[PDB]
Amino acid sequence: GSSGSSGTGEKPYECKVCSKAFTQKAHLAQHQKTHTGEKPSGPSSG
Numbered sequence: 446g447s448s449g450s451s452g453t454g455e456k457p458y459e460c461k462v463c464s465k466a467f468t469q470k471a472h473l474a475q476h477q478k479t480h481t482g483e484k485p486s487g488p489s490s491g
């Protein structure tokens with residue numbers, strides 16, 4: 446089963462649907478386009 450393993454530290458940009466982390470916003474923002482899905486705000490809002 447998938448594991449939420451990560452390296453020492455945490456990225457400022459992270460997805461919710463796929464749960465992927467990006468180095469920059471441009472990448473994430475653009476990535477979303479792929480998802481092409483409309484979902485609510487999950488837990489751990491922070």
Ligand SMILES: [Zn+2]
Nearest residue numbers: 460462463464
């Ligand atoms: Zn995503």
